Amino acid sequence: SEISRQEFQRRRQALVEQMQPGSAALIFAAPEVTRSADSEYPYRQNSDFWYFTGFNEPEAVLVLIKSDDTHNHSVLFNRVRDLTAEIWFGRRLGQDAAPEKLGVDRALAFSEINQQLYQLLNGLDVVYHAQGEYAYADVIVNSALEKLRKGSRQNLTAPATMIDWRPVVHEMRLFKSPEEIAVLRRAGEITAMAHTRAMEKCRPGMFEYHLEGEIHHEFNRHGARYPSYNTIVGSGENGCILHYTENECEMRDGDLVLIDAGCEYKGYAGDITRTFPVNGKFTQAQREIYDIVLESLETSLRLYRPGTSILEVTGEVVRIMVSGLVKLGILKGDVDELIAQNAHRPFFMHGLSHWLGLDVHDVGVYGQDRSRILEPGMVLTVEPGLYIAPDAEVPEQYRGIGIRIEDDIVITETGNENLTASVVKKPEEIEALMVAARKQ
Amino acid sequence: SEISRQEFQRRRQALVEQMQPGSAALIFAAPEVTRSADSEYPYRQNSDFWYFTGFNEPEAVLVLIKSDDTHNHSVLFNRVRDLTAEIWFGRRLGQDAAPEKLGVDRALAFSEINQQLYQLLNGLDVVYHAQGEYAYADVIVNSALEKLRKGSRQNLTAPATMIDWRPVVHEMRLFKSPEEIAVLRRAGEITAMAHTRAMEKCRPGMFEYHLEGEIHHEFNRHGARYPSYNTIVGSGENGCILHYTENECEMRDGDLVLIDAGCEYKGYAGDITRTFPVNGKFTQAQREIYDIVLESLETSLRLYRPGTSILEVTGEVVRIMVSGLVKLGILKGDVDELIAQNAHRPFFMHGLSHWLGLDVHDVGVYGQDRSRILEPGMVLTVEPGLYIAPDAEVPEQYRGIGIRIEDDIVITETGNENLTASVVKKPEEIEALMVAARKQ
Amino acid sequence: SEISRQEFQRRRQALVEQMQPGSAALIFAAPEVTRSADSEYPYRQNSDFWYFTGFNEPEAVLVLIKSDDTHNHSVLFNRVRDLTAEIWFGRRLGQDAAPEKLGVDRALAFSEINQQLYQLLNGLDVVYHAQGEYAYADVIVNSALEKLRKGSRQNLTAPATMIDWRPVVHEMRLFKSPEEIAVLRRAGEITAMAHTRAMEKCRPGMFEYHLEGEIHHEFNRHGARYPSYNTIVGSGENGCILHYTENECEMRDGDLVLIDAGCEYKGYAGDITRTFPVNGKFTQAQREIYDIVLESLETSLRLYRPGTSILEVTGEVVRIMVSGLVKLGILKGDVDELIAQNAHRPFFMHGLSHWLGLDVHDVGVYGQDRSRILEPGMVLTVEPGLYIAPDAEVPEQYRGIGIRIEDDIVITETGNENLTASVVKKPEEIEALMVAARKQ
Amino acid sequence: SEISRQEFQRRRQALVEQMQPGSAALIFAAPEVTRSADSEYPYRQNSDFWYFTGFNEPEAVLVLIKSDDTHNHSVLFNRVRDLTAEIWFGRRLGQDAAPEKLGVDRALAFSEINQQLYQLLNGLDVVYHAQGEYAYADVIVNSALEKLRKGSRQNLTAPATMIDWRPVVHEMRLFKSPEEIAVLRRAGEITAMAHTRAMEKCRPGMFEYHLEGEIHHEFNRHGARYPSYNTIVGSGENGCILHYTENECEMRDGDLVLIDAGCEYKGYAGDITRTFPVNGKFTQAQREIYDIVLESLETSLRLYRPGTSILEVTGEVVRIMVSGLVKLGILKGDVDELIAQNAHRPFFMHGLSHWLGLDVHDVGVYGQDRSRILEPGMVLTVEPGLYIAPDAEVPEQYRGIGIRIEDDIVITETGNENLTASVVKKPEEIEALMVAARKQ
Ligand SMILES: CC(C)C[C@H](N)C(=O)O
Ligand SMILES: CC(C)C[C@H](N)C(=O)O
Ligand SMILES: CC(C)C[C@H](N)C(=O)O
Ligand SMILES: CC(C)C[C@H](N)C(=O)O
Ligand SMILES: [Mg+2]
Ligand SMILES: [Mg+2]
Ligand SMILES: [Mg+2]
Ligand SMILES: [Mg+2]
Ligand SMILES: [Zn+2]
Ligand SMILES: [Zn+2]
Ligand SMILES: [Zn+2]
Ligand SMILES: [Zn+2]
Ligand SMILES: [Zn+2]
Ligand SMILES: [Zn+2]
Ligand SMILES: [Zn+2]
Ligand SMILES: [Zn+2]
Ligand SMILES: [Zn+2]
Ligand SMILES: [Zn+2]
Ligand SMILES: [Zn+2]
Ligand SMILES: [Zn+2]
Ligand SMILES: [Zn+2]
Ligand SMILES: [Zn+2]
Ligand SMILES: [Zn+2]
Ligand SMILES: [Zn+2]
């Protein structure tokens, strides 16, 4: 699955549709990012820039100019072609090929942006710019506007109104098209295959990072070169750290291992968590906590649909959690009082769900306490967890248990589609998978 | 292999030894680095900060204060412990454990650095600071010095002399200790095992990124989680791009594939290039170019020793290259004239060797044209290559061939030790390796 | 004459009237400005900040918040009272007295602006801010908006629309109220008295700066402590430099002296130029050039009225100039051709008129080539000049003559009122004034 | 009196003398400074830049390069000549005339400083730069050093040592040459004449600013166009504010007026305070406080000499003050206890003396509590004062009295020379001066 040329074109037109007439929108590319000295991290394009272009180079700027309700055009600034630079660091699109390749009307050299940008903004009323996103972008934009402000004698006028396009653009990104959903569907399968493989490879005495290695290899073999976030492999007490990425410990028989890992496929994030026994067999104490987290997830998967919210479903999860913890003697008291006191918070201290897309924690307005009414096309995670600290004042057997189980879903007309159910989460199915792998 | 507590202590003392009395050296940690939105790249500590500490957290500053030739102390600024932040993002050393853990005299909270740093610099004559390395560091240091400058009435005085410690520290890093050499020796083995595996896995119809996946998995399984640089897998014409990292093409029977890849093991870079046939059998035209690059490497490995230089060995390589290219009809004319005209430069447009250490292109002064006399303990690469452009005006059979063969060496008392010879480079040995793997 | 409390209130309401509902306007005070080391120049408030407040302190910010068409309020941030700081540097209004003194609803400490400003902007749709005016203001505003942008979990939202208020506010300042006109009327009288005195004091052998001293003393004695711009006293060839402020030369019998000087009275600029003979008697050559400049001025004073423009009146001046210069043999050819070739430009290289108000070169849109149709309440200068370079290829007697004659006017319903005609400009009246003074 | 070409040359050589070999010193000019919109304050050159050049333009940089103990040269960067810019804003030295005019070896265009400065610093070991003095200077210097640091392949090397020259240069400025002393002697006379005139002009019902006007006129008529600091005219309770510059009040019969005012003559500051009765006759209560301040001054003038300090003389002043205040019942108790408790500090809350030169509060190290041993050539003020607050709990008659009497002195071989004694300070002489003037 991929995003078509036509889709990128549709998105640009959808942005232009919302823009005032006599305006320009400026969308800047991500800078290259140093890892150490002269070596740089693998390039990751700005998600919003990528959303409108599918162009994976730095030093680029998309300019969408709306003259009126029927008349608009696009200008790309991008790196010029350079034989020496390209022999050394890799091929560049350049200006000639860009209009056709990316469906823009005009392409200019990024090295001329200071000489040309003010001319494109001259006489407009409004400029859409994400102020503070990148310092290099702010310098370029402020410099253009100052030229215009101070160029009265040259008959130049700056637009007096600057609008942040991020709210508009993030609202667009919040609702996935069919093409985006097909891509996220594949990201979900790829990620699921990685998680299955980790379960099948796990043995006592392997290190946490070994499962990371298996996962990343599986991502790569399906064409997802990079993870969407730094992989989490927390065995034992490390499972109680939500974004544990050290992955440095020997995995011990008797411990659980929590894997939070997701591929990046055509820019889109998969995001799965599976927790399972290092030795392939859950203990009673492990099952007792796992079953609460699993019921929370399964109930949420049943409930999520148009017209509810993350807040409303979270309320049900809290009830399931508080009830289960009371039955185990981890909480003491009346269930409804304990709920009213948020007595679950020492053990479940994060949200049930986040938006998912070009960013793993995706853009889009949640509303107060994530109360926004869900509609079809929204994509989100469902990730209940219980994390009992090594030093929690609870029965000894539950201490140092961290369990999270996470699926990715898209809201549909009648409910939701689960993108990540091809990896098992029922404990008996986990155990069968691991037994079968140990034979073979 | 690892770097000991004692070694980090020795390095600090070696820096202090060279410092003026009545001075302080400020070594700042790398910032965290955004990959996209709220997600960050895997943390990579500043190499120089790491060199003196082995401490892998951001928001940290090592302060070495020399009062006189016998009297000095160390202060660390680092992140305070925070239960919520650590539950979320991971464990922190904190102040209590730091003196013992890292062998410093005193540890303070980074959040108090603006309140405390000027007090440590008050009344000193000299401050060693790497100005321009990081903007956050410059703000902190300039702010401290301004307080002192303007604090005459509070009996404060700023040091008037600021010295860049990078030349001193990079000169130290240029000469590897026995411990560092043992670590780089292991990085070389790990990297070699990855390259062998790539050769054994390569088949026509696999993508360039699949060999990347195999390599990264092999790095990871030996405890080297990350590469030291972005892996290069250039098959066909992509082999003519020196830092080709797109790795996006289907590998075709008949093409060569050039793999430049290195692990990062305890901070230290492995760095190997092997070029080989995708189908396991070199053609005549491929052998003809390969043999020139291989003779260049083998001759350089024989020559490199104390008392020569990269420049001097490069001169021999150029002769080998120009002679081979004339025999193939790629160059025409007198060998010595062609050498004097640098007629090899369209086909070999980079240096034979770079320093290797905590950075893959390591710090340390090369001298003009890399003429510095080599001494024992210097670690460097040997990487001749020939890159014939798809459109070069040469016999058709050589067009679009990129070949590089690279080993990592340490200069010894009598010559050099090759750290990467455990992966094959003789063409018949490459072919036997790939045949054996294809059976199975 | 002064500006009333009620007037400042009317201006604020007039700004609020034009603002969108659910918006705030931020108007920042001028910074203190170093002259050398720890000494600062006399404080000059930002003209726009002054326009809305009449408040003459630094570290202050006026915030006008419009909730809707009937509901708005004002918040001032200003310096807190401080006995030690005030004993040392002077009295401060503080917070208690400010509401009553300046007619604002609320006053807060400037030292708390970062803790309070984001709370005032929370949930608004629009912020009016003069971006780039002052760096300290930009830091404060950007910092407030980032808090809001990133404060989703604390139920904070930034206004997405930022509008430059300078066009709106400068359009207001372009039209003077009756109160402003009475103040500028007094500034014109004060400035005129200074110019008369300079003419009466001038003798050969006095320095250019001596007339500056006389002028500044006269400004001061009527309560205008500072000039509105740096005083120009160009005798001889120095009269050909438009903003000659060195004022360092001995004034020589036989030379003319050009004085461009204006007081600052209650913030408003007077702006007069008178050129006259150092020895009290114009030569023939001096009269010949002077009469052209004087006819230009007198004709412009007759012409300026509602419905014409600076451009249209300039056209008449150019004709008068080109004709006069042709009669003297300074220009050669057909008058209408010479006009079409702008042949006057080597001798008259500036505009006839600029807006006048809180700035000597006042704010307000001119239109292309100063073609804006004049309306009642506009205040402007009328300043024709002829400047014949020492090395101009013209008859010897005209070389090194610089003459400018400038009056300040307000456009009325039927024409204009001259604010500066109480100082003489007819040459015979100049000569009589100087003769009478010499007796003284 | 003036500073000779030879003197500026001597100063430069004296700086070069102290510089390390293989070094360059960079001394930058002051920026132009906005007063409001497009109008700028009268230009004031950086004191240190002026000290070495006598050059009064912005956008200039003096570069002194020391190759070794006998070999050095000077390069000036300055504004290029421009007919249009000079016709508009005034004449420029340019490059051709600069070597001869300012005694430098070479002059280059400031517009080429980024292309040329790094070439001048290439291969040096040390750069002397006043870091943080001006932001534009820091940008230029850091930019030059980064080019060198990163220009290894172009055989460029940055100096690794940066030294602040301000301590060295301010130590030089602390000791005035005979030429400087003659200039300050004239500044003292000019300032004295202004103060005498203010006393002679003062009448009840005149405003504080009227005396300011008289003073500034007198400065100007002797060729000192500007004051060295903003003039202080505090009548009544305004005399209790140390840097009262509002000068806005009507001067009332019965009140004292305190005038702190100084000219700037050839860059050098005069600095005098005289306090006197508005009506020409001191009351008993006024005399009682005045006599304490006058004895303090007269005793200090007797005491100041080589080998004492400001601290040591201040101790005597404190004794005189505490004793006088006890006799008046303003302080109660034992004199020596009151001294030990610093009981004078509510009434005398500033230092007796500051260095005087190119800045009114001149550069140079004071030592702890101004304990530095005085040597010949040091120039300083002597300014005791007593300031009794309107609300001080003291006998009613002393409330709201501010008195300061200040002279400027140079330390000589045997004592001091008073530069400002040509204006009267004995009360009977003040009264006679004012009576004589009233007849006017
Ligand atoms: C940043 C958030 C949108 C997601 C995060 N997992 C939370 O629940 O708090
Ligand atoms: C940056 C250099 C030290 C290394 C690079 N491979 C070259 O030879 O040019
Ligand atoms: C800056 C302008 C408004 C005024 C200037 N005197 C000119 O005519 O060019
Ligand atoms: C700034 C100081 C050197 C001078 C000031 N008058 C004081 O005595 O405190
Ligand atoms: Mg346990
Ligand atoms: Mg071929
Ligand atoms: Mg003449
Ligand atoms: Mg009284
Ligand atoms: Zn069009
Ligand atoms: Zn997360
Ligand atoms: Zn997850
Ligand atoms: Zn998630
Ligand atoms: Zn010690
Ligand atoms: Zn490389
Ligand atoms: Zn390599
Ligand atoms: Zn290499
Ligand atoms: Zn209200
Ligand atoms: Zn002007
Ligand atoms: Zn004027
Ligand atoms: Zn004017
Ligand atoms: Zn020389
Ligand atoms: Zn002072
Ligand atoms: Zn003074
Ligand atoms: Zn003083």
Side-chain angles (χ1 to χ4, degrees), chain C residues 36 41-42 214 217 245 359, chain D residues 36 41-42 214 217 225 245 359:
Chain C
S36 179
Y41 281 105
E214 294 297 314
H217 188 270
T245 56
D359 288 292
Chain D
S36 179
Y41 281 105
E214 294 297 314
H217 188 270
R225 277 175 94 190
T245 56
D359 288 292

Side-chain angles (χ1 to χ4, degrees), chain B residues 122-422:
Chain B
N122 178 41
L124 300 181
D125 292 325
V126 175
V127 50
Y128 298 83
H129 169 58
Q131 180 142 99
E133 189 66 23
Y134 299 117
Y136 90 94
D138 287 349
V139 171
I140 292 170
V141 173
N142 293 334
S143 183
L145 296 176
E146 278 291 304
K147 277 172 198 204
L148 297 166
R149 278 166 204 152
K150 289 166 167 165
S152 179
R153 288 180 187 272
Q154 296 74 52
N155 313 314
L156 304 178
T157 60
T161 300
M162 178 175 291
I163 300 175
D164 191 359
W165 53 252
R166 280 167 301 195
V168 176
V169 170
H170 295 172
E171 183 63 17
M172 292 170 65
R173 287 177 52 191
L174 182 58
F175 292 82
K176 278 55 170 180
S177 69
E179 282 191 29
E180 291 183 279
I181 287 156
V183 174
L184 280 151
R185 194 176 282 132
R186 182 52 177 172
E189 288 176 345
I190 290 168
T191 302
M193 280 183 289
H195 281 265
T196 294
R197 171 176 173 178
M199 284 185 292
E200 292 177 324
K201 297 290 187 156
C202 187
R203 303 284 186 281
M206 286 170 63
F207 285 70
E208 291 166 334
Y209 64 76
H210 286 135
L211 298 189
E212 173 182 323
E214 294 297 314
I215 281 156
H216 293 175
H217 188 270
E218 190 69 16
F219 291 171
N220 175 277
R221 88 166 183 83
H222 304 296
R225 277 175 94 190
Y226 310 112
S228 49
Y229 52 97
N230 299 317
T231 297
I232 293 147
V233 189
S235 73
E237 300 177 2
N238 299 327
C240 299
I241 292 157
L242 299 186
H243 304 95
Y244 176 76
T245 56
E246 279 69 17
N247 305 349
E248 68 186 340
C249 297
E250 178 183 50
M251 297 188 298
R252 311 273 275 147
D253 172 274
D255 286 351
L256 296 178
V257 61
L258 183 158
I259 307 190
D260 201 335
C263 73
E264 190 168 276
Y265 181 73
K266 315 305 182 56
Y268 291 82
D271 181 8
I272 293 182
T273 312
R274 290 291 187 270
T275 308
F276 56 93
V278 172
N279 66 12
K281 178 78 214 183
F282 288 94
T283 67
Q284 181 187 357
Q286 287 164 356
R287 277 300 301 273
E288 280 166 351
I289 304 299
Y290 191 90
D291 289 358
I292 300 164
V293 181
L294 182 60
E295 190 183 328
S296 291
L297 176 56
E298 288 176 340
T299 295
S300 297
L301 294 168
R302 180 172 67 76
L303 287 178
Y304 268 131
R305 67 197 184 270
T308 195
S309 66
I310 294 168
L311 180 60
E312 187 169 46
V313 176
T314 299
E316 295 305 323
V317 169
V318 164
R319 173 166 293 273
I320 290 158
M321 283 174 176
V322 171
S323 316
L325 294 170
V326 167
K327 287 181 185 66
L328 305 175
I330 296 174
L331 291 172
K332 317 201 170 296
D334 181 78
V335 164
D336 294 323
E337 291 181 6
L338 289 168
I339 289 168
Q341 298 167 334
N342 296 293
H344 66 286
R345 269 171 189 171
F347 314 109
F348 178 49
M349 67 294 297
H350 62 84
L352 184 60
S353 296
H354 56 79
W355 308 130
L356 182 67
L358 290 173
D359 288 292
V360 69
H361 299 148
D362 209 25
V363 302
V365 171
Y366 282 96
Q368 185 175 349
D369 300 321
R370 314 192 200 182
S371 58
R372 180 164 182 169
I373 300 312
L374 298 172
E375 304 178 56
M378 290 174 171
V379 182
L380 61 157
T381 69
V382 193
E383 57 183 300
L386 289 166
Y387 317 96
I388 324 305
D391 65 321
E393 277 166 41
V394 302
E396 185 282 330
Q397 66 262 34
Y398 306 121
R399 300 182 194 144
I401 291 176
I403 297 174
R404 176 163 67 257
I405 318 168
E406 166 174 30
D407 275 337
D408 305 329
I409 63 164
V410 42
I411 303 306
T412 60
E413 298 293 330
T414 53
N416 75 79
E417 178 190 347
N418 193 335
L419 303 179
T420 55
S422 57

Side-chain angles (χ1 to χ4, degrees), chain A residues 243 349-355 361-362 366 370 383, chain B residues 38 88, chain C residues 153:
Chain A
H243 304 95
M349 67 294 297
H350 62 84
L352 184 60
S353 296
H354 56 79
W355 308 130
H361 299 148
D362 209 25
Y366 282 96
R370 314 192 200 182
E383 57 183 300
Chain B
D38 60 325
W88 273 82
Chain C
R153 288 180 187 272

Side-chain angles (χ1 to χ4, degrees), chain C residues 190-250:
Chain C
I190 290 168
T191 302
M193 280 183 289
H195 281 265
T196 294
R197 171 176 173 178
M199 284 185 292
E200 292 177 324
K201 297 290 187 156
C202 187
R203 303 284 186 281
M206 286 170 63
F207 285 70
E208 291 166 334
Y209 64 76
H210 286 135
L211 298 189
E212 173 182 323
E214 294 297 314
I215 281 156
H216 293 175
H217 188 270
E218 190 69 16
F219 291 171
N220 175 277
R221 88 166 183 83
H222 304 296
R225 277 175 94 190
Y226 310 112
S228 49
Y229 52 97
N230 299 317
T231 297
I232 293 147
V233 189
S235 73
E237 300 177 2
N238 299 327
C240 299
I241 292 157
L242 299 186
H243 304 95
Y244 176 76
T245 56
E246 279 69 17
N247 305 349
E248 68 186 340
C249 297
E250 178 183 50

Side-chain angles (χ1 to χ4, degrees), chain C residues 79-96:
Chain C
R79 286 168 159 201
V80 77
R81 300 215 66 193
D82 198 84
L83 185 47
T84 301
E86 292 184 59
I87 281 170
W88 273 82
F89 308 119
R91 296 188 191 82
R92 292 173 178 188
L93 184 58
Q95 283 71 58
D96 281 345

Side-chain angles (χ1 to χ4, degrees), chain A residues 33 35-36 38 40-42 87-88 91 209 212 214 217 225 230 238 242-243 245 264 359 361, chain B residues 33 35-36 38 40-42 87-88 91 209 212 214 217 220 225 230 238 242-243 245 264 359 361:
Chain A
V33 170
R35 177 165 187 278
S36 179
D38 60 325
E40 299 176 318
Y41 281 105
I87 281 170
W88 273 82
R91 296 188 191 82
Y209 64 76
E212 173 182 323
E214 294 297 314
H217 188 270
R225 277 175 94 190
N230 299 317
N238 299 327
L242 299 186
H243 304 95
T245 56
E264 190 168 276
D359 288 292
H361 299 148
Chain B
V33 170
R35 177 165 187 278
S36 179
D38 60 325
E40 299 176 318
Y41 281 105
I87 281 170
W88 273 82
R91 296 188 191 82
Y209 64 76
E212 173 182 323
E214 294 297 314
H217 188 270
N220 175 277
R225 277 175 94 190
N230 299 317
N238 299 327
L242 299 186
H243 304 95
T245 56
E264 190 168 276
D359 288 292
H361 299 148

Side-chain angles (χ1 to χ4, degrees), chain C residues 35, chain D residues 26-33 43-51 53-63 76-79 110 113 129-130 133-138 140 165:
Chain C
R35 177 165 187 278
Chain D
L26 316 180
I27 304 155
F28 285 80
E32 286 155 295
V33 170
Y43 185 69
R44 175 50 155 71
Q45 188 50 274
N46 179 273
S47 295
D48 288 317
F49 185 88
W50 177 262
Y51 188 69
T53 63
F55 184 50
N56 201 35
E57 298 184 26
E59 302 192 298
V61 189
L62 182 59
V63 183
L76 180 68
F77 290 91
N78 66 317
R79 286 168 159 201
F110 181 83
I113 193 167
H129 169 58
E133 189 66 23
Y134 299 117
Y136 90 94
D138 287 349
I140 292 170
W165 53 252

